[PDB]
Enzyme design. Structure first.
Site, short mmCIF file in Angstrom:
data_model
loop_
_atom_site.label_atom_id
_atom_site.label_comp_id
_atom_site.label_asym_id
_atom_site.label_seq_id
_atom_site.Cartn_x
_atom_site.Cartn_y
_atom_site.Cartn_z
N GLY A 226 -7.84 57.31 -0.88
CA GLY A 226 -7.39 57.95 0.32
C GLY A 226 -8.32 58.93 1.20
O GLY A 226 -9.55 57.93 1.46
N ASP B 284 -12.35 45.24 1.53
CA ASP B 284 -11.03 45.30 1.22
C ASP B 284 -10.77 44.51 0.00
O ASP B 284 -10.03 44.93 -0.96
CB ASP B 284 -10.27 45.01 2.61
CG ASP B 284 -10.03 45.98 3.44
OD1 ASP B 284 -10.76 47.19 3.21
OD2 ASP B 284 -9.67 45.68 4.54
N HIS C 19 -15.20 51.24 -2.52
CA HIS C 19 -14.76 50.88 -1.22
C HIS C 19 -15.23 51.68 -0.19
O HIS C 19 -15.69 51.05 0.88
CB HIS C 19 -13.15 51.06 -1.35
CG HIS C 19 -12.56 50.20 -0.25
ND1 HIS C 19 -11.81 50.85 0.77
CD2 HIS C 19 -12.68 49.08 0.28
CE1 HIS C 19 -11.49 49.85 1.64
NE2 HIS C 19 -11.69 48.83 1.40
N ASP C 20 -15.21 53.12 -0.41
CA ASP C 20 -15.89 53.93 0.56
C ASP C 20 -17.11 53.65 0.80
O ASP C 20 -17.65 53.65 2.09
CB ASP C 20 -15.72 55.49 -0.06
CG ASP C 20 -14.19 55.99 0.40
OD1 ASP C 20 -13.11 55.25 0.42
OD2 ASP C 20 -14.15 57.21 0.15
N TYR D 18 -8.31 41.84 11.02
CA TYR D 18 -8.98 40.65 10.44
C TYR D 18 -7.81 39.58 9.85
O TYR D 18 -6.73 40.29 9.98
CB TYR D 18 -10.07 40.78 9.49
CG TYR D 18 -9.65 41.56 8.31
CD1 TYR D 18 -8.97 41.04 7.27
CD2 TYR D 18 -9.87 42.86 7.99
CE1 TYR D 18 -8.49 41.61 6.10
CE2 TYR D 18 -9.35 43.60 7.17
CZ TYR D 18 -8.64 42.99 5.99
OH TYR D 18 -8.21 43.63 4.81
N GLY E 233 -11.23 61.53 2.10
CA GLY E 233 -12.71 61.26 2.02
C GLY E 233 -12.96 61.15 0.60
O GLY E 233 -12.92 60.09 -0.08
N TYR F 110 -17.39 50.47 3.12
CA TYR F 110 -17.28 51.01 4.56
C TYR F 110 -18.54 51.59 5.03
O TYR F 110 -19.02 51.58 6.32
CB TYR F 110 -16.09 51.76 4.91
CG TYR F 110 -14.79 51.10 4.70
CD1 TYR F 110 -14.62 49.45 4.54
CD2 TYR F 110 -13.56 51.84 4.82
CE1 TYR F 110 -13.24 49.02 4.67
CE2 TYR F 110 -12.33 51.22 4.94
CZ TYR F 110 -12.15 49.75 4.92
OH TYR F 110 -10.82 49.25 4.59
N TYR G 46 -11.27 59.78 -4.75
CA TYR G 46 -11.68 59.02 -3.57
C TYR G 46 -10.56 57.96 -3.09
O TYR G 46 -11.00 57.49 -2.02
CB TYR G 46 -13.00 57.92 -4.04
CG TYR G 46 -14.07 59.03 -4.25
CD1 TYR G 46 -14.33 59.46 -5.48
CD2 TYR G 46 -14.93 59.04 -3.15
CE1 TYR G 46 -15.41 60.42 -5.64
CE2 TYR G 46 -16.19 59.82 -3.24
CZ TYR G 46 -16.39 60.43 -4.54
OH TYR G 46 -17.36 61.43 -4.67
#
Ligand SMILES: COc1cc(O)c(C(=O)/C=C/c2ccc(O)cc2)cc1CC=C(C)C
Length: 121
Positions: A29, A89, A47-48, A64, A31, A51, A27
């Site tokens: 990097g 993040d 994290h994925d 940001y 997809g 998002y 995961y």
């Protein structure tokens, strides 16, 4: 955006996002599918997923702002997308720091086909 994130990861772990966290496990990097391979890979999967519940935001390009209050990452005010991206993040940087000890090079450049099995957010 990927720039703030890459800096964040570096400040935390000391390692550079690319190639350390750009092609790790299943995961980190490009997809992901399959079972996260280790803790550092679990961070990427989450994290994925993070998002994932910001459908109308653009994590990779929306920039940001964040400061450091004596160690602590503090996300500054922005649009609602920027605040929530920052938080995603942020947790990954920490999750990374928190699992450095088990970071394994055996998992860098992991082949696709070994990313087998299924996992929901
Ligand atoms: C300063 O940073 C950059 C950073 C980047 O990450 C990239 C880049 O082109 C692609 C990156 C990557 C893509 C998917 C992913 O899951 C992890 C890393 C490209 C650039 C900058 C390029 C210039 C040519 C000024």
């Amino acid at each position: 955006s990927l720039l703030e994130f890459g800096k964040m990861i570096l400040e935390e772990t000391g390692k550079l996002a690319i190639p350390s966290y750009s092609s790790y496990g299943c995961y980190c990097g490009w997809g992901g599918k399959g079972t996260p391979k280790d803790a550092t890979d679990r961070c990427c999967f989450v994290h994925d997923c993070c998002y994932g519940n910001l459908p109308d935001c653009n994590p990779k390009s929306d920039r940001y702002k964040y400061k450091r209050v004596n160690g602590a990452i503090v996300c500054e005010k922005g649009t609602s997308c920027e605040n929530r991206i920052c938080e995603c993040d942020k947790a990954a940087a920490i999750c990374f720091r928190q699992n450095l000890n088990t970071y394994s090079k055996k998992y860098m450049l992991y082949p696709d086909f070994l990313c087998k099995g299924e996992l929901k957010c």
